[PDB]
């Protein structure tokens, strides 16, 4: 059972710079016929994988000359020179010399200048309230780095349960991330309190951004 | 072109069978090996099965205990994956792929298979609009909250696809046995509500589309 080990798990690279990804196999990938069946695939956000390099160093049709694969035996390297934003996503190595297995993937991240989130808050819609549910939502759009924290407060008091935080992958347009934070309450709890607040800590600012509303003003 | 298109997968109960198909086009089908691979989030890619030119020789991931059968109708250009005695670990996105010299040079878009005893449930779609005596700047961010559906997936589009540039789609999360996701769009504030904004949410598993118009 041949294991393909990739490092690093995530690789941050500035535009124009070079990225280097390592793939190692637990047994030699030299087939008895002499070929080395070691290939590289790229999976971009929301897409299927696509072939990049086959048989260690062969670029597939449509792949820029700046993708280069090398290595032998058990040690292989994918090099991407002059990185562009559209290169972002997960690179997987694959071997098929033996019973076929895949590496765990390396996520290429594009570096950019830190950016603060744009924060929007929304009360529960009247539609949902008619249903007995009450979800409050905060969108945090176009921020970098990806690391960000959202804290909800009801009447000033932190509530930890009932929160769903969901990040997009990195956008190749601006190298930013966005995330949505949904606090789901019952209508009953919602109608017993007034102040609903989401606080975003990002360190892109020394002080957290706050967005809030009062149930009585909606 | 080139192109492989998987069938709808969807929800299946444990112990029951289900069969995926994959329509190939743009090459002599009996001239390429074909394969299925699957991807579980948090698990990565797993080779499931492959088949030679005429179906006389197949390979299967050993741990599938002969429960999966790969086959091909050369006459109809179709690749099949029969999944018998279905189990919970088989929940995944399944890709159809063309196999040449050990590599997979064409991939389908993938189809998700969810193995659960739970019922199909259509989404509730809720408007997200500025409220509460907020002010608006030069632009306005609107959204739809898509709640309470099962299984994955849904697709959200804005104004039937004609608004696309400023859209964010937030991946679904499972809570209480039901999925929740959201989507946001930003438009110049002077163009809304004067020029209507409607999100369209399609959920193939429940055969349902909900088209929610954003009101102030």
């Amino acid at each position: 059972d041949v294991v393909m080990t990739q490092t690093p798990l995530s690789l941050p690279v500035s535009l124009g710079d070079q990225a280097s990804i390592s793939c190692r196999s637990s047994q030699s990938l030299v087939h008895s016929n002499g070929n080395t069946y070691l290939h590289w695939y790229l999976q971009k956000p929301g897409q299927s994988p696509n072939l990049l390099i086959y048989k260690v160093s062969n670029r597939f049709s449509g792949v820029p000359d700046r993708f280069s694969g090398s290595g032998s035996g058990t040690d292989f390297t994918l090099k991407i020179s002059r990185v562009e934003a559209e290169d972002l996503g997960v690179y997987f190595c694959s071997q098929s010399t033996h019973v076929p297995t895949f590496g765990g993937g390396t996520k290429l991240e594009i570096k950019r200048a830190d950016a603060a989130p744009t924060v929007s808050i929304f009360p529960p819609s009247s539609e949902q309230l008619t249903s007995g549910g009450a979800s409050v939502v905060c969108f945090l759009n176009n921020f970098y780095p990806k690391d960000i924290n959202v804290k909800w407060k009801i009447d000033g008091s932190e509530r930890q349960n009932g929160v769903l935080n969901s990040w997009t992958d990195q956008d190749s347009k601006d190298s930013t991330y966005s995330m949505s934070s949904t606090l789901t309450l019952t209508k009953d709890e919602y109608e017993r309190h007034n102040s609903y607040t989401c606080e975003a800590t990002h360190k892109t600012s020394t002080s957290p951004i706050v967005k809030s509303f009062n149930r009585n003003e909606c | 072109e080139v192109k492989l298109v998987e069938s709808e997968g969807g929800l299946v109960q444990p112990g029951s069978s289900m069969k995926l198909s994959c329509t190939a086009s743009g090459f002599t089908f009996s001239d390429y090996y074909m394969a299925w691979v699957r991807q579980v989030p948090e698990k990565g890619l797993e080779w499931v099965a492959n088949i030679n030119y005429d179906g006389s020789s197949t390979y299967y991931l050993d741990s599938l205990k002969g429960r999966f059968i790969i086959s091909r109708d050369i006459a109809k250009n179709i690749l099949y994956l029969q999944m018998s005695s279905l189990r919970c670990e088989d929940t995944a996105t399944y890709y159809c792929a063309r196999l040449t010299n050990g590599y997979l040079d064409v991939w389908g878009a993938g189809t998700t298979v969810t193995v659960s005893s739970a019922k199909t449930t259509p989404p509730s779609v809720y408007p997200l609009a500025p409220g509460c005596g907020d002010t608006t700047g030069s632009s306005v961010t609107l959204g739809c909250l898509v709640k309470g559906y099962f299984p994955e997936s849904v697709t959200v589009t804005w104004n039937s696809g004609s608004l696309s540039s400023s859209v964010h789609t937030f991946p679904a999360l499972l809570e209480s046995g039901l999925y929740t996701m959201s989507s946001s769009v930003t438009v110049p504030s002077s163009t809304w509500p004067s020029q209507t904004v409607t999100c369209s949410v399609a959920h193939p598993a429940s055969s349902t589309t909900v088209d929610k118009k954003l009101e102030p």
């Binding site: 016929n33 069946y37 033996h98 | 090996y33 390979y59 196999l99």
Partner: peptide
């Protein structure tokens, strides 16, 4: 000729 090299 092989297309699935671990088999053949």
């Amino acid at each position: 000729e092989p297309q699935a090299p671990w088999m053949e």
